[PDB]
Amino acid sequence: DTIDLADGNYVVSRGDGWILSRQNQILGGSVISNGSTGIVGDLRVNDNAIPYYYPTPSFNEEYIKNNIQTVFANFTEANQIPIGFEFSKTAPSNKNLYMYLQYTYIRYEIIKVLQHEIIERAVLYVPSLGYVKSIEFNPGEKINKDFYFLTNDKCILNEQFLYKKILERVLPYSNGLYVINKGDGYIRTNDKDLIGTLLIEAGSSGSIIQPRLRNTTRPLFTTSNDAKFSQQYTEERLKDAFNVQLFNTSTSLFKFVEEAPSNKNICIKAYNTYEKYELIDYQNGSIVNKAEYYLPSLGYCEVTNAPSPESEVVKTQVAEDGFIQNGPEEEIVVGVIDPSENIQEINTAISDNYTYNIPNNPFYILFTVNTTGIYKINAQNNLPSLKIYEAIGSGNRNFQSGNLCDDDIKAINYITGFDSPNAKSYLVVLLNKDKNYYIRVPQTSSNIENQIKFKREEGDLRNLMNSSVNIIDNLNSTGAHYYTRQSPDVHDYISYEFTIPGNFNNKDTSNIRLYTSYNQGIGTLFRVTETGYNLINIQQNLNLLNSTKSIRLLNGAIYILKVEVTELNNYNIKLHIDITN
């Protein structure tokens, strides 16, 4: 026939809901009477789900299968999983109803177009779901032959003609591993995840069913790097983040049931779905490795008013390969222990003071504290810089007074600390007694003993709460200095402890310009009196971006500036300490 398409070969979906010549009653039917309900159903499986190919000299079976499976639903992978369906009809209160069952199919075609004419067409019918036809009858009644017997193939829904030409944001995340739940109800384009379509006539019911007769599910997986982020590695990380236990099996049942009102015909399309997880290796403000894992989920059901079988068919082009999300928007970001980095434990709940010895690759220390309190945590001479995380949902399970219970959690929430191994720093942090925490100690280039010290702070240092504290040690006589670190998020703090150059006579003073380069924030500056440490507040509410303001500070005296980020413009925060006469 005639067609407005450039010359070439096209794969075509003509839609679901096709029934086949002559094959109407081959499954039998039911006779119900007098207000009773009949429910007839079936299960599309291996042996009753036979595709029927109608090839042509240019388009053989193989060519057809390949071109259809490339663009449309892969019916070979789909056909080992039993999918059920059922229809319900109620008989009138003084009449008999005859209902019979027929398999439906999707019609695919391969067409050759020369000069706006289709000069060859191959057809493939792919098993889909089913259709019930019923009629009310009395003894005697002559019923039209066509109720029982179809002379020519046809669609019980509206036909389609969907074709394809055949050819030939600052993320201030700490460095580490993240698993992100990006939400549910993902399907692929072009009906690749279509289970099937039922036509549910007025005052009847219809169901599409996943009964888990087999448990097999089919996850979808891609990776920027199969050496680091293999499928198995990605599954282990999903396990660490969300305790996903089953990847390619499920016992979880789903089905969709639709009762069509009086005087309305309904179309129910049912789809397989996935829940989309991202596994990212995040370093220095960028994605270094990324894997996508589409976990098999529990379906999507589209209900439309059933259009005419007869309305005109609009030739439409297929979408690009890809995914459509039909579930709600969602982004859950969960850090995970890097399994290449070993976990050491402190079994004693920390009291007031504790010292952990370190005989080397990065590793974690798991620990808890006896009483909620602010803690200073540092290595010896403040090297290396540490990070600390919360084990997520820890501390709600097993407990023992004065000791650690490892409740086995590798989902971690970053609190504070830099990925600057060789920067001097100490952490100051509020630690809740009913949680477990991880210290991360980075890669050291050393032979020496090192120690992590934990000290409950009950003094002024408390006012540096939830802060890493950088120790500046290279303040020259005058001139400009900058210190670049990973920026904390908005409302999160970073702190700098520095000695003004020169000898202390309590009289000699230098001018100090404290400003940031990219990010806005609030500074609180404090004189250190060295009791622990006493902090005298000497400048509040400083506003740091590009600030020109100047303050005079005592030579050889020690100060700490606390910075609350307020504007996150850049992954990095760069503090300047410029000193003059």
Ligand X SMILES: CC(=O)N[C@H]1[C@H]([C@H](O)[C@H](O)CO)O[C@@](O)(C(=O)O)C[C@@H]1O
Q: Give the binding site for ligand X (CB under 6 A).
A: 422-423, 474, 481-484
Report 72-131 residues binding a copy of itself (CB under 8 A): 86, 88, 96, 98, 100-101, 117-123
Q: Does 419 bind a copy of itself (CB under 8 A)?
A: no
CB of residue 518 vs ligand X: minimum separation in angstroms?
A: 12
How many residues touch a copy of itself under the rule CB under 8 A: the total is 113
CB of residue 385 vs ligand X: minimum separation in angstroms?
A: 9
Judged by CB, which is closer to ligand X: 161, or 483? 483
CB of residue 537 vs a copy of itself: minimum separation in angstroms?
A: 32
Q: Under DSSP, is residue 91 helix (H, G, I), strand (E, B) or coil? A: coil
Nearest to 509 by CA among 531, 472, 478: 478
With CB cut-offs between 5 and 8 Å by kind, which of ligand X, a copy of itself, none does residue 358 bind? none
Q: What DSSP state is assigned to residue 352? A: S
Q: How far apart are CA 106 and CA 71, in angstroms?
A: 14
Q: Does 380 bind a copy of itself (CB under 8 A)?
A: no
Q: Which residues, 6 or more positions from 580, have their beta carbon under 8 angstroms from its beta carbon?
A: 478, 510, 511, 513
Between vectors from CA 554 to CA 468 and to CA 508, what angle results, nearest 5°? 155
Q: Which of the stretches 368-376, 394-402, 418-426, 521-529 binds a copy of itself when contact is defined by CB under 8 A?
A: 394-402
- Choose which of 288, 313, 332, 538 interacts with a copy of itself (CB under 8 A): 332
CB of residue 331 vs a copy of itself: minimum separation in angstroms?
A: 8
With CB cut-offs between 5 and 8 Å by kind, which of a copy of itself, ligand X, none does residue 504 bind? none
Q: How far apart are CA 456 and CA 438, in angstroms?
A: 17
Judged by CB, which is closer to ligand X: 23, or 478? 478
CB of residue 194 vs a copy of itself: minimum separation in angstroms?
A: 14
Q: Does 371 bind a copy of itself (CB under 8 A)?
A: no
Q: Determine contact, residues 577/504, Cβ cutoff 8 Å.
A: no
CB of residue 422 vs ligand X: minimum separation in angstroms?
A: 5
CB of residue 233 vs a copy of itself: minimum separation in angstroms?
A: 18
Q: Does 35 bind a copy of itself (CB under 8 A)?
A: yes
Q: Does 275 bind a copy of itself (CB under 8 A)?
A: yes
Residue whose entry in the numeric block shows the structure tokens 């970001």: 333
Q: Does 196 bind a copy of itself (CB under 8 A)?
A: no
Between vectors from CA 349 to CA 345 and to CA 355, what angle results, nearest 5°? 70
Q: Is 278 exposed, middle or buried (0-12, 13-18, 19+ CB in 10 A)?
A: middle
CB of residue 212 vs a copy of itself: minimum separation in angstroms?
A: 8
The DSSP string of 454-472 is EEEE-SGGGGG-SEEEEE-
Q: Does 149 bind a copy of itself (CB under 8 A)?
A: yes
Q: How many C-beta atoms lie closer than 10 Å to residue 233's C-beta?
A: 17
Q: Determine contact, residues 18/107, Cβ cutoff 8 Å.
A: yes
Residue whose entry in the numeric block shows the structure tokens 């789903």: 254
Q: Determine contact, residues 432/504, Cβ cutoff 8 Å.
A: no
Q: Which of the stretches 147-155, 164-172, 351-359, 371-379 binds a copy of itself when contact is defined by CB under 8 A?
A: 147-155
Q: How far apart are CA 70 and CA 169, in angstroms?
A: 35
| Residue 348 token pair | 């004693």
| Residue 139 token pair | 């003894």
- Choose which of 396, 447, 506, 581 interacts with a copy of itself (CB under 8 A): 396
| Residue 369 token pair | 């504290």
Report 398-417 residues binding a copy of itself (CB under 8 A): 398-401, 403, 405, 407, 409, 411
Judged by CB, which is closer to ligand X: 372, or 422? 422
Nearest to 404 by CA among 436, 357, 438: 436
Q: Does 345 bind a copy of itself (CB under 8 A)?
A: no
With CB cut-offs between 5 and 8 Å by kind, which of ligand X, a copy of itself, none does residue 54 bind? a copy of itself
Judged by CB, which is closer to ligand X: 423, or 461? 423
Pairing relationship of beta strands 425-431 and 373-379 according to DSSP bridges: antiparallel
Q: Does 137 bind a copy of itself (CB under 8 A)?
A: yes
Judged by CB, which is closer to ligand X: 110, or 561? 561
| Residue 119 token pair | 């000069």
With CB cut-offs between 5 and 8 Å by kind, which of ligand X, a copy of itself, none does residue 313 bind? none
CB of residue 423 vs ligand X: minimum separation in angstroms?
A: 4
Q: How far apart are CA 440 and CA 427, in angstroms?
A: 12
Q: Is 341 exposed, middle or buried (0-12, 13-18, 19+ CB in 10 A)?
A: middle
Judged by CB, which is closer to a copy of itself: 17, or 38? 38
Q: What DSSP state is assigned to residue 382? A: G
Judged by CB, which is closer to a copy of itself: 150, or 522? 150
Q: Which of the stretches 169-177, 273-281, 452-460, 562-570 binds a copy of itself when contact is defined by CB under 8 A?
A: 273-281
Phi, psi values for residue 239, rounded to 5°? -60, -50
Nearest to 514 by CA among 556, 472, 454: 472
Judged by CB, which is closer to ligand X: 111, or 423? 423
Judged by CB, which is closer to ligand X: 306, or 423? 423
Judged by CB, which is closer to ligand X: 413, or 569? 569
Q: Does 319 bind a copy of itself (CB under 8 A)?
A: no
Judged by CB, which is closer to ligand X: 204, or 416? 416
Q: Determine contact, residues 51/124, Cβ cutoff 8 Å.
A: yes
The DSSP string of 113-171 is EETTEEEEEEEEEEEEEEEEEEEEE-TT----HHHH--SS-EESS---EEEEEEP----
